[PDB]
């Protein structure tokens, strides 16, 4: 059984989305983590391919876990009375964007751009394979430090992707766009379009551009620190208030900010080791 079958370390992590420890695969000694999510907060439920009932966040990790190293793959899953147990992949070492700024503080436009053309790679293998992750933020963003590699995690508030209204959301606010806040309706790509702005500004700037529902209704961006006049057009696009307005990812990726990009290796020569 799953006991056996690992080796439990100690805990990574705690929050809303459930408790993640440290593991060791016993077979090949593969590093791993261990996730637990009790039943009784599972919201969203979904199916495999097979008809098995289990969390939608077991669906949604099925149909990415795939040979792309831009997001964090599942091993293998366990049903327990009241919990799940999902075995994720572990790089090591590991560092979340969200503890890497918070060091380090607003991140050189060179890394910025590697890091966020990475993520943009990340939320089009999703988007790609039917899945909309819904909570794109520094926390739920892994660094590979050896490879300079980012790793997308935490798919708990995600949902299949489509083309209709959604009128549910679970992921953070301060990362939630205009039309959510006001009318509680968004459409998927957009909405994740605009959360990538609030993400862009936050590398740049080492902070979030909102805090209250008032300024991402106002959706004014003010430069706390110096950004090149490229970086702020980008982030300003990708922050229009009319989800109309909003750049594509085709747009995003050809945008003048975003050319030039380092390779991930590079990125960890230059900027990680
Ligand atoms: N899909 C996922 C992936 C994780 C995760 C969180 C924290 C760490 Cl250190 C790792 Cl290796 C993975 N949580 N949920």
């Known amino acids: 059984p799953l ?5 439990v370390g100690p805990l990574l992590g705690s929050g809303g989305f459930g408790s993640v420890y440290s593991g060791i695969r016993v077979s090949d000694n593969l590093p791993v983590a261990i996730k637990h999510v ?3 907060r599972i919201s969203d439920w979904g199916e495999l391919p097979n008809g098995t009932r289990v969390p939608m966040e077991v669906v949604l990790l099925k149909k990415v876990s795939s040979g792309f190293s831009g997001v964090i ?3 293998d899953w366990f049903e327990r009375p009241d919990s799940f147990v999902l075995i994720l992949e572990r790089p090591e070492p590991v560092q979340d964007l969200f503890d890497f700024i918070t060091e380090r503080g607003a991140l050189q436009e060179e890394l910025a751009r590697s890091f966020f053309w990475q993520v943009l790679e990340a ?8 899945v909309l992750h819904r909570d794109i933020k ?3 963003i892994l660094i590979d430090l050896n490879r300079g590699e980012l790793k997308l ?3 708990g508030s995600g949902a299949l992707l489509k083309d209709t209204v959604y009128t549910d959301f679970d992921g953070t606010r301060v990362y939630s766009p205009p039309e959510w806040i006001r009318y509680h309706r968004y459409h998927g790509r957009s909405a994740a379009v605009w ?13 979030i551009p909102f805090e209250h529902d008032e300024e991402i209704i106002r959706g004014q961006v003010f430069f706390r620190q110096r950004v090149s006049s490229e970086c702020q057009h980008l982030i300003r696009w990708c922050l229009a208030l009319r989800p109309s307005d909003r750049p594509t990812f085709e747009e995003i990726q050809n945008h003048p900010w975003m050319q030039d990009v380092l390779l991930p ?3 960890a020569e230059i900027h990680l080791h």
């Open 195 to 207: 959360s990538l702005g609030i993400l862009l500004y936050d590398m740049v700037c080492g902070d």
């Open 3 to 7: 006991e056996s079958q690992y080796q």
């Open 38 to 40: 009790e039943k009784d």
């Open 138 to 140: 520094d926390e739920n």
């Open 153 to 155: 995690i935490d798919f």
């Open 123 to 130: 939320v089009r293998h999703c988007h790609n394979c039917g």
């Open 265 to 267: 290796q590079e990125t």
């Open 73 to 75: 793959r599942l091993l």
